[PDB]
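Notebook B, p. 112. Complex prediction, attempt 2.
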Amino acid sequence: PSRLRKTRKLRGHVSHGHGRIGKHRKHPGGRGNAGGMHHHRINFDKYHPGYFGKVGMRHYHLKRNQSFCPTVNLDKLWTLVSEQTRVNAAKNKTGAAPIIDVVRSGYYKVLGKGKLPKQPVIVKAKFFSRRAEEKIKGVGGACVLVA
Amino acid sequence: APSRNGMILKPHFHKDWQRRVATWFNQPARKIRRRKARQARARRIAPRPAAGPIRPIVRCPTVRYHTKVRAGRGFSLEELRVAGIHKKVARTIGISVDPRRRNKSTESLQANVQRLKEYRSKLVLFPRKPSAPKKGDSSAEELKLATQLTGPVMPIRNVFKKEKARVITEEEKNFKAFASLRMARANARLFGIRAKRAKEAAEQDVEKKK
Amino acid sequence: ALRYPMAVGLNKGHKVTKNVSKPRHSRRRGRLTKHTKFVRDMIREVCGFAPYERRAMELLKVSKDKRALKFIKKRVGTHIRAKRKREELSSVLAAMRKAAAK
RNA sequence: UCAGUAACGGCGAGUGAACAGGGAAGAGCCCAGCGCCGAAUCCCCGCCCCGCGGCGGGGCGCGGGAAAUGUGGCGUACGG
RNA sequence: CCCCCGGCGCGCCGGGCCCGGGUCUUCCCGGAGUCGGGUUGCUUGGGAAUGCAGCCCAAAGCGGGUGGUAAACUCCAUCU
RNA sequence: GAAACACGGACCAAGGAGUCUAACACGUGCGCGAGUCGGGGGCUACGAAAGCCGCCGUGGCGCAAUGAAGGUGAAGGCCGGCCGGCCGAGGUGGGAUCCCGAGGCCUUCCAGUCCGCCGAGGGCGCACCACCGGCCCGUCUCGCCCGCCG
């Protein structure tokens, strides 16, 4: 909506909001990211530290599908299954633990960030973290690996 | 000239991009032309399915996707061999065939052979000439119920197997998952160097005895 | 000691029973036929050997296998082709010496 | 969509794909060679019939030519 | 409503038309100044050279190509 | 520093200059909310619109970081004999608001209750700020121990 823009208010003011001394010229500092090392040195070192230089090894033909490993924390581990399972597990007196297969839900690794409710589980995952295992055992569950 | 704080932007607009801008104003016209051509094709092959031939069940490569199942290009030749279908007849009854596929597993092979059995049973075959119903052709009455099928024929639904709640035993209670991951990760890493030093250790025993 | 199928290790991967079938007929290409062999050695009788092959065999009679291979390698190209070409030229050098003895 | 990514680059300015995945569409095939069949093949002229504004079909010609320095049928890596 | 264009089957005549599948045994099977190597120049995101071309070298047949870092050895995979 | 012996301008009419696209940032409005989004594709005059499709959310961004990389990947305390029970998600200071209430709120006089109001003081303390601990990844130093198919 041009009727709301600033140019509608600048009609009649000579310099059009760019000053009389320092006219609005074409490219007073160079085009694009020019002078990153010479006359824009301060800006690049104050707001983009680490911009210039090489670091690390090169991986020529990178396929993102090999390093694919979505993770899930223990705090929302119980959100993968329906609530009916979570309440029938505590209601159950046999002690049968429900099975929570994360790779079916879409995750591979299980990280132990949160606290777990005190009732056993059987977590089927592809990988585990050390804390994630230690928390599952403490609740009384079991860590089942799959491939 | 960068202002106070922002990103270092690299817009790829240094060529003559304005001469090669593809606008999409024909998009609604293309969607219409596609649909009309799709319906015109369905009327041309009226009793046959609109989607086309059946595709096989297929895993995905690239560990990101191997838990899912697609529709392949066509059935492999050994899937047709076990299903008792000549490879030059399957296209004539609507069975996609591609000779490039191999079968490394048996369940993928058996899942598609089981799929062709389910299709060959659901197939209403018309006689070559209505005057003389031949052998493999359908009985006269179900030709009256043969109508065009819409959507992908026998759609591939990626289904899971639910597991009943079990009581945890002691071995799976005492299984050290993280330790076994780090251990097995190290065994694969130090497998070649260990086999070398162990073979090397045979070099000095023969020198020590003799 | 339960064994779970892991995603890492010497034998990682989803456990699936493999089926063996006779390999594709295209895998068979390059295999020597007893009739094709009868042709390539028949032409050997007619055509002969290339000048670099004769020169290599000269290096082989005086037992200069290292120099003979370095020579062939600079001619034919890679080291794999050079190696195979060497033992083929020496089998011809042995087969003619055996026939010369008899 | 991957992705302004892996990578390239006075590694500066800048440049920059692919696989997988989801769709549109979907269709596969033929020789040479290797061999079998009596060249079993093709072009053209003359006659007969049929149509003859896409000169074609059939027949008859000890009619001419091409072709054994390879025509045709079978058959092509999914094997034959 | 009236013309024109092809469509769609039906029937007649003149034609070519004998053809497949399975098991078993016995035989057969492949594209060269090309691949590849060196080098030069261009090109590429392709980085001890992605592609292309010139010049020189110049193949093999359980071989050959590919397997994104040059090389040897050794297993696999994958195409032809 | 211009009335300038600075430059442009004889006069009139009409035309005549911060735009669009992409990216990014912050602010703001709206919808939904640990989700969100069909933009691509399908399905059913104005209409090339609108509606629909989640077994069309593939995918994007977000929900986890860190290391060059191999990789790893986000509280603890007590009791009992390394195991068994219990308590189990930091603290300090300042904090808008709420809470308690020592008391105290007139017609003929006292006794005299309910409601409402006020208030010394005392509390739970939002957001946020300052600080102190804690946890994850990299790295360094110092060590003691554990575990098992090889």
